[PDB]
Every structure is written in C-alpha cells, then in structure tokens.
C-alpha cells in the first residue's frame, strides 16, 4: 500500500514464485480485486499464465477469490499476507516451542506447501519424522491440539468448502502480543507479577483482540492460576502492585484490567530506544531516553509518527537484505552450481576425490557465502520482530 511495502511484496513473490506470479500478484495488490480476463488484459499476460499464477497464489493462501454479480469470480491479494512470508520462521519456531517437532512440521508443511487436507499433513509429517517409526495417531493428535487452540484453521469456503488447512496468523499474533507483555512485566517487575498478567491474558482469550482486556475478577483469576503453591492474600498484594505501577499496564476499576494499548505503546518506544542506541551510541541513547519520559530530526514524545516511519525504515531494510542475498548468490551462481553437482555425486554412493572438485579457496568462498546468507537471514527475522511490534502498536492506534 506504500512503495516500500509494494517493493517488498514484489521481492518476496519473485524469490518464492518467479516472474509471472510476481507480475499477477503485484498487479492485484496495486489494482485491487478483479476477474481473470481483466488481469490477463491489464497485465498483457496470456489467459492461461494468469490461470496458473492465480493457482500458485491461491495454493499459498496469498490470493483469495469471491463470486460477485453472476458467476463472475474476482481475485484479490492482500499486501500484508505476502509480507507475512517473512514471519514464517517465527510461526514454525513458536509451534515447536508449544508442540513437539510434530507441531513444528505441521505448521511448516501448511505454511510452505500451502493448502493441505488434515490427511495430507498427517501423512507428510509422520513420514518426515519416520525418516529421522512415527505413529500417525500422535501426529493427528498434535494436529487436533493445534486446531482446538486455533493455531491451525480450515480455509474459508470448486470452491473446496473447508477441506483444506491454513495456519491461523491472527492466533500466532495474539500469542506474540501476550508473550511480549508478559516478558516486559517479567523484566521490569517480579515473575509472579508476570504469571498473573499471563493467566489474565490466557483467560481473556475470550473477548480479544479487536485497547483494554475484558474486565476480570480477583476471585476467578485465583481459581484460573496454574498448579503452583500461592495464597489469595499474596495474589491480591500482586494485583495492587500491578495497578499502582510506572509502565501503566493496569488501572482496575476486586475487578482488574490490562491496558493493551499502553502495553504496546511502551513496547514500541523501547524498540525506538534500541534503534537510537545502535545508530547513535550509548551516550546518545541516554539523551533520547529523558526526552521520552532537535539534535536529530525527531519531535518531543511523538509516539505514532516515529513508529510509523521506523516501520517504513524496517520495510526498506528488509528489502535491502533480500536484494543483497540475491546479489551474493547471483555473483557466485557458477560456484554454488558446482557445489550442488558435487553434492549429487556423493549422494549416489572414493568420496575424497569427489570432494576435491571444490578447491580450498572455493570452499573458503562457499563457507563465507553460507555465513553471510545466515547473517542476512537472522537480520531479516530480527527486523520482522520490530515490524510485528510497530504494526501491532500502530494497528491498536486505529480505535
């Protein structure tokens, strides 16, 4: 919806799917919801290339479709959903964190392969865990836990009416939001204070996420606490300290509430401070801290516009990271092709003379590239962690 995000979508769509898919994808992003003939005409693409490109995009949950007026299907792509391709490593990891390699592989399969039936996922995962015997029933049980906890959901309703599975991104997001609030409350408070916020966020998963938590009572919060030795008097002292606290994650009016917008507001600002410390230094990070709670172009306590433009800078840097990775990998096209071919000979199996095909300076270059690629990969994940926080905060500031 801005050139920064549209350049990013373009890059992702081509890296993952190539020329025509990028062409059709970017088009539906730029020009909006429209039928096949128009896409074909407006893009100067053959009606079958459009048909195929849309199939790949639908398969990958990147393009949705709808029947309007009479029998006329209009295709639509969401710029945001394409940028979520950058968050896939986090979704997959978060799953492993909660469920085993079973959870990890289910979400990896659904995210990377696209639309799959519960059957196709269970089969694909069991085989994958067997090659490292995997009981398909345990795979199926993990899938059911994911679906019950809404981390995984059926695609909206050929027109194959709910027979396919999709990872629920809105669920991973509220989890990331809740995870962040708790961690903030743990690093600035008491851990017993963070656990109280956690259960409060856990039980208020009902009446979320469309500024403030659903009002919760002291009596029910006590009953909903996990299996851990704690008296009602101790907990009541903790809600009271949560109420009267500097970050302002609570207000109450026993009935207690979590100030979700202030929670995101303070997460956003702390992320701004980190950029100040990395770009300007520790001496300059101390100056720009007191101005919060002009030497360099910004305004006194301007929360939104700073985050709103830091997001723009995040989209630009992620786009720069991708371009550099493509550049590094293109400048070594011949060598990594030699590396690929050398790997193929060893797989068919003496071995030492086949390895020798790659010279020591060539292996020094392949390792430097692997190190550099892993470095750019890691930055991309780390920048998206900032993107999530800025986006969430900015989305919450649309009340």
Swiss-Prot record:
Intracellular or extracellular location(s): Nucleus
Gene3D superfamilies: 6.10.140.1450, Winged helix-like DNA-binding domain superfamily/Winged helix DNA-binding domain (1.10.10.10)
Functional description taken from the UniProt entry: DNA-dependent RNA polymerase catalyzes the transcription of DNA into RNA using the four ribonucleoside triphosphates as substrates. Specific peripheric component of RNA polymerase III (Pol III) which synthesizes small non-coding RNAs including 5S rRNA, snRNAs, tRNAs and miRNAs from at least 500 distinct genomic loci. Part of POLR3C/RPC3-POLR3F/RPC6-POLR3G/RPC7 heterotrimer, coordinates the dynamics of Pol III stalk and clamp modules during the transition from apo to elongation state. Pol III plays a key role in sensing and limiting infection by intracellular bacteria and DNA viruses.
PANTHER family assigned: DNA-DIRECTED RNA POLYMERASE III SUBUNIT RPC3 (PTHR12949:SF0), RNA POLYMERASE III DNA DIRECTED -RELATED (PTHR12949)
Documented effect of changing residue 240 to K: Loss of interaction with POLR3G and POLR3GL. No effect on interaction with POLR3F
Protein name as catalogued: DNA-directed RNA polymerase III subunit RPC3
Family: Belongs to the eukaryotic RPC3/POLR3C RNA polymerase subunit family.
Keyword flag Transcription: yes
InterPro entries linked to this entry: POLR3C_WHD (IPR055207), RNA_pol_III_RPC82-rel_HTH (IPR013197), RNA_pol_III_Rpc82_C (IPR008806), RPC3 (IPR039748), WH-like_DNA-bd_sf (IPR036388)
Main location: nucleus
Keyword Iron-sulfur: no
GO MF term list: DNA-directed RNA polymerase activity; single-stranded DNA binding
Subunit text: Component of the RNA polymerase III complex consisting of 17 subunits: a ten-subunit horseshoe-shaped catalytic core composed of POLR3A/RPC1, POLR3B/RPC2, POLR1C/RPAC1, POLR1D/RPAC2, POLR3K/RPC10, POLR2E/RPABC1, POLR2F/RPABC2, POLR2H/RPABC3, POLR2K/RPABC4 and POLR2L/RPABC5; a mobile stalk composed of two subunits POLR3H/RPC8 and CRCP/RPC9, protruding from the core and functioning primarily in transcription initiation; and additional subunits homologous to general transcription factors of the RNA polymerase II machinery, POLR3C/RPC3-POLR3F/RPC6-POLR3G/RPC7 heterotrimer required for transcription initiation and POLR3D/RPC4-POLR3E/RPC5 heterodimer involved in both transcription initiation and termination.
Biological-process GO terms, alphabetical: defense response to virus; DNA-templated transcription; innate immune response; positive regulation of innate immune response; positive regulation of interferon-beta production; regulation of transcription by RNA polymerase III
Keywords carried by this UniProt record: Antiviral defense, DNA-binding, DNA-directed RNA polymerase, Immunity, Innate immunity, Nucleus, Phosphoprotein, Transcription
Organism: Homo sapiens (Human)
GO cellular component terms, A-Z: cytosol; nucleoplasm; RNA polymerase III complex
Extra facts: Antibodies against POLR3C have been found in the sera of patients with systemic sclerosis (SSc).
Transmembrane domains' residue ranges: none
